[PDB]
Amino acid sequence: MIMEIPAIKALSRYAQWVIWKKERDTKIPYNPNNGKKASSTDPLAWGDIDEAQAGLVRYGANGLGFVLTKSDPFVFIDLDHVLDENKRVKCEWARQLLKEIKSYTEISPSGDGLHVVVSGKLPDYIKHKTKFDDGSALEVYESGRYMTITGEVFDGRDDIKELDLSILGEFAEHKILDDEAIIDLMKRKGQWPDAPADGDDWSSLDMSFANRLAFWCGKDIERMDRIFRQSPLMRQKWDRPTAGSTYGRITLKKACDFVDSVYDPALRNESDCPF
Ligand SMILES: Nc1ccn([C@H]2CC[C@@H](COP(=O)(O)OP(=O)(O)OP(=O)(O)O)O2)c(=O)n1
Ligand SMILES: [Ca+2]
Numbered sequence: 001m002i003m004e005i006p007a008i009k010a011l012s013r014y015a016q017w018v019i020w021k022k023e024r025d026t027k028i029p030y031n032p033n034n035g036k037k038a039s040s041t042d043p044l045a046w047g048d049i050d051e052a053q054a055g056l057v058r059y060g061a062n063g064l065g066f067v068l069t070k071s072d073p074f075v076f077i078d079l080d081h082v083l084d085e086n087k088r089v090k091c092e093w094a095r096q097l098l099k100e101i102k103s104y105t106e107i108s109p110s111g112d113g114l115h116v117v118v119s120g121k122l123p124d125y126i127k128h129k130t131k132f133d134d135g136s137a138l139e140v141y142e143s144g145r146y147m148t149i150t151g152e153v154f155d156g157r158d159d160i161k162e163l164d165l166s167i168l169g170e171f172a173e174h175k176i177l178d179d180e181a182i183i184d185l186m187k188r189k190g191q192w193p194d195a196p197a198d199g200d201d202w203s204s205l206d207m208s209f210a211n212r213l214a215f216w217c218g219k220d221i222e223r224m225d226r227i228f229r230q231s232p233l234m235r236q237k238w239d240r241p242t243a244g245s246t247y248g249r250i251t252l253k254k255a256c257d258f259v260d261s262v263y264d265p266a267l268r269n270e271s272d273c274p275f
């Protein structure tokens with residue numbers, strides 16, 4: 001039955017299978033060989049799919065499980081309480097997520113949730129759990145955990161695909177004065193940049209804007225930094241460590257060395273063509 005699904009065929013290549021039983025409102029994984037409680041970090045507590053299938057009958061478990069490790073690339077996307085009694089997606093965020101992420105999708109054991117399995121890499125800035133007022137929730141896991149495997153294929157999505165998971169950052173929660181006069185003057189003179197499009201060298205747009213910022217802000221490297229973070233060119237790379245500094249501070253220091261003219265509340269017909 002399930003072992004013919006292409007996603008189950010892919011997971012069957014690994015000896016990372018367990019079985020699970022519903023102890024109250026949690027799901028405890030078990031070693032399918034000896035029947036003792038299994039650990040998600042000890043590989044010898046697992047077995048292949050055939051030992052999990054056999055151990056499922058012997059000890060009478062609720063279903064199969066697959067342990068996610070730091071060495072296999074499977075991403076477990078858990079959508080809690082997104083289906084109605086007819087197994088139709090009732091949450092609007094889940095309908096949009098399933099449109100943006102098309103991979104193996106199965107109905108979770110309780111019958112009202114969904115599991116999405118993707119071969120990729122999670123964004124490092126999203127939380128592992130995001131609760132919604134709907135009562136639904138979005139959970140993402142890459143390792144140190146096991147996921148229940150039902151095989152109840154949803155919408156014919158029976159194959160694990162390799163996808164980029166940046167779109168998850170728009171569905172899940174994330175984690176960790178006189179500038180306005182300068183900003184208005186820059187927009188006035190056409191010195192304020194647009195948001196970067198697709199195919200553009202974002203790093204090249206940073207230096208051009210930083211060069212302009214070095215002129216209008218008077219090489220006040222702290223003011224140039226405050227204004228850049230309020231610009232459409234801001235991103236995580238700005239604060240990323242690079243050779244003892246940050247990519248942002250190295251860029252702002254380069255801009256100060258590159259420009260000669262300086263706006264000094266007097267006249268502003270000195271440097272740099274408008275965007
Ligand atoms: N140490 C463990 C063991 C259990 N879980 C895993 C097991 C399944 C997974 C998903 O959580 P649930 O939604 O509660 O289980 P489910 O398989 O998705 O079942 P359902 O969503 O239908 O209730 O979490 C975990 O977080 N880490
Ligand atoms: Ca779930």
Ligand SMILES: [Ca+2]
Pocket residue numbers: 078080139
């Ligand atoms: Ca859950």
Ligand SMILES: [Ca+2]
Pocket residue numbers: 068069070071072073074075142143
């Ligand atoms: Ca992994």
